[PDB]
Design a protein around this nucleic acid. Structure first.
Ligand SMILES: [Mg+2]
Ligand SMILES: [Mg+2]
Ligand SMILES: [Mg+2]
Ligand SMILES: [Mg+2]
Ligand SMILES: [Mg+2]
Ligand SMILES: [Mg+2]
Ligand SMILES: [Mg+2]
Ligand SMILES: [Mg+2]
Ligand SMILES: [Mg+2]
Ligand SMILES: [Mg+2]
Ligand SMILES: [Zn+2]
Lengths: 116, 57, 83, 178
RNA sequence: CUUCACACAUGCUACAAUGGCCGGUACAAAGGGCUGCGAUGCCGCGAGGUUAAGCGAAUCCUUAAAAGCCGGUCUCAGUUCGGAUCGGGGUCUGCAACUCGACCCCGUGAAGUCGGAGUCGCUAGUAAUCGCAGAUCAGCAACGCUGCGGUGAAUACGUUCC
């Protein structure tokens, strides 16, 4: 029972299980289930082949998921980098890009302490 | 050497979600094998910054 | 100005300094201080000497810098790795 | 009575003859053998390939593979001569035809983010090689009964004399290139 | 004035089941409002947009308090915990939102599984925890400050030691 990835964690309800798709969160999962017809309170174990085929087509009909979405994100980042903008410069330097504070924080953009 | 070395290898049946059905002989799976995608349904077998600015404005 | 009811924002002195040249030729560097002006799909091929606080930097609007600001290509601060 | 074999013998043999002006039917290329190996690395470490490779290559192919042992010693890999490092099987005959069919038809498309095998991975004589990364698309194995994942690479040896001839043969057989 | 190999200090959010999410439902005080508050209705998933009743106000708006109670689900997992970072698309204020604003939506889902030596506050409507309001203010304060209420403990033998 695979959509693109495995997406069949052992004994998960369908709305939560769908979030394991890279590109679907809770809201996307809720509208997927509402659109197809499968109820949220239903385990991924008890999913039929026809239910799977219904919810399969509808994700590439509308949404964007593993692979192409991951390509588009890095495409945007790379475009910013070689266009020569301020955000791209900060992407190259490995610094926060949305105007954060770098005096005492930014420990996610930077790694752990380097202890000069 | 073929006494008790190779696994079972007997006629099976492949059925796909689209409906493309054929049959060969596979391993341990006893009879029919049900698949979701095949070579007859999978894609790749079946086939502007200024634009965005103007469609925004 | 950053809301889809008023369109983009360019300074009038910058617009009337580019639209009375692009109609005939790709004018050379336009010395300007208007970092806050967004690049419209008419600055293509032009070049601007944008102020950075101490001097003017030439920037060539090619194709993809059509939604950003003139200032984004004129860095103001200088940092070069304490050590 | 492998359907890929009869489709070959029925259309591919004379399609290739129409393409390349073979004056003798003995010159028509064909696939002679298909070789699959795992190429394990945990030889010095944990010494387990008896099931990591043997007990699943059996499932993918249908015959027990052979265990390969290092020919010399390398210190940078902790490799000592004579210990099991690779597991290889040689498919040939109708089993090879059936494996090629079962691959191209239902296994190869199942690869996640599959966009088409490269057509430039020929050897220069007509022999094609490509690799995988896991106990996926082969439905024969179950992820519920596997240890750590591991890939393989497959060699498709042909009687073709040139890369273009081999590529034409594989395209006719049903290998999706791009 | 917002820099950033680092260091310190004060805080907020967490590391979950005395919990998270969903549905229904009860109970405050103290304040603000004409360059203002916008009830109602219509549009929008939402931030919001438009019309516009009333109101210099114990009469209008602010005004839905939240923890709480009932039911359902999740079943101990780096998770339906956590919400940083980043991608896309927007709203509003403002001549102007790149440097350098807040907020909304979709996606992304990091460290973190209770914290070394050490160190801080508190003796009762207190500590702990939950919301609300104001000043500054075009916007930025639901992490600061000054206040307001809700729920509501455990201990004190004693003066040897600091
Ligand atoms: Mg300061
Ligand atoms: Mg959560
Ligand atoms: Mg609730
Ligand atoms: Mg509505
Ligand atoms: Mg989570
Ligand atoms: Mg960790
Ligand atoms: Mg835990
Ligand atoms: Mg301690
Ligand atoms: Mg204010
Ligand atoms: Mg704070
Ligand atoms: Zn199919």
């Amino acid at each position: 029972a695979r959509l693109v990835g495995v997406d069949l964690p052992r004994d998960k309800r369908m709305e939560v299980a769908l979030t394991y798709i890279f590109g679907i969160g809770r809201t996307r999962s809720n509208e997927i289930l509402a659109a197809t017809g499968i109820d949220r309170d239903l385990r991924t174990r008890d999913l039929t082949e026809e239910q799977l085929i219904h919810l399969r087509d509808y994700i590439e009909a509308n949404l964007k998921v593993e692979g192409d979405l991951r390509r588009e994100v890095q495409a945007d980042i790379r475009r910013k980098i070689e266009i020569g903008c301020y955000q791209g410069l900060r992407h190259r330097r490995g610094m926060p890009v949305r105007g954060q504070r770098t005096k005492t924080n930014a420990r996610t953009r930077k790694g752990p302490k380097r202890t000069i | 050497m073929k006494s008790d070395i190779h696994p079972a290898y007997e006629e099976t049946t492949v059925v796909c979600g689209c409906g493309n059905t054929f049959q060969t002989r596979s391993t341990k799976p006893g009879g029919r094998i049900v698949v979701e995608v095949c070579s007859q349904c999978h894609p790749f077998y079946t086939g502007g910054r200024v634009a965005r600015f103007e469609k925004r404005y | 100005p950053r809301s889809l009811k008023k369109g983009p924002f360019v300074d009038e002195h910058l617009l009337k300094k580019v639209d009375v040249q692009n109609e005939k030729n790709t004018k050379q560097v336009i010395k300007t201080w208007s970092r806050r002006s967004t690049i419209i799909p008419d600055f293509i091929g032009h070049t601007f000497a944008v102020h950075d606080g101490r001097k003017h930097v030439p920037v060539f609007v090619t194709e993809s810098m059509v939604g950003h600001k003139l200032g984004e290509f004129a860095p103001t601060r200088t940092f070069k790795g304490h050590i | 009575q492998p359907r890929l074999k009869e489709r070959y013998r029925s259309e591919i043999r004379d399609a290739l003859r129409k393409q390349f002006g073979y004056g003798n039917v003995m010159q028509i290329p064909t696939v002679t053998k298909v070789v699959v190996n795992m190429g394990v690395g945990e030889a010095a470490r944990d010494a387990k390939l008896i099931n990591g490779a043997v007990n699943d290559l059996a499932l993918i192919t249908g015959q027990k593979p052979e265990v390969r042992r290092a020919r010399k010693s390398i210190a940078q890999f902790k490799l000592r001569e004579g210990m099991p490092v690779g597991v290889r099987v040689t498919l040939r005959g109708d089993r090879m035809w059936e494996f090629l069919d079962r691959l191209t038809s239902i296994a190869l498309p199942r690869i996640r983010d599959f966009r088409g095998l490269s057509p430039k991975q020929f050897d220069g004589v007509g022999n094609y090689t490509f690799g995988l990364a896991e106990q996926a698309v082969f439905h024969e194995v179950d992820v519920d009964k596997i240890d750590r994942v591991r890939g393989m690479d497959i060699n498709v040896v042909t009687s073709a004399a040139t890369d273009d001839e081999g590529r034409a043969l594989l395209r006719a057989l049903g290998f999706p290139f791009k």
